[PDB]
Subunit: 34 residues, 3 copies
Amino acid sequence: ALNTLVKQLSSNFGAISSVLNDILSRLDKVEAEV
Amino acid sequence: ALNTLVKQLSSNFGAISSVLNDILSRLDKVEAEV
Amino acid sequence: LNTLVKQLSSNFGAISSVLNDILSRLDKVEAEV
């Protein structure tokens, strides 16, 4: 159903944001060490 | 309605592509320094 | 909503693939600094 899809999408995008933020923070730290 | 959802999704996916591209670009550069 | 769901599945699969490649590459650089 539509409402279920929308909830799934919010969870997916939330997880993607989390993973991207972790990557960005780690990449910042590596860049600072070169 | 559906049109609103599709526009929101399109915007979300565009932002994710932009961020991924920036990360890939930055990773390429760091890999060259280590 | 079959068409949209199929498109979304494809997009999310591609994102997971790209994220995995990034995480692998990031792990290696962290080990090399």
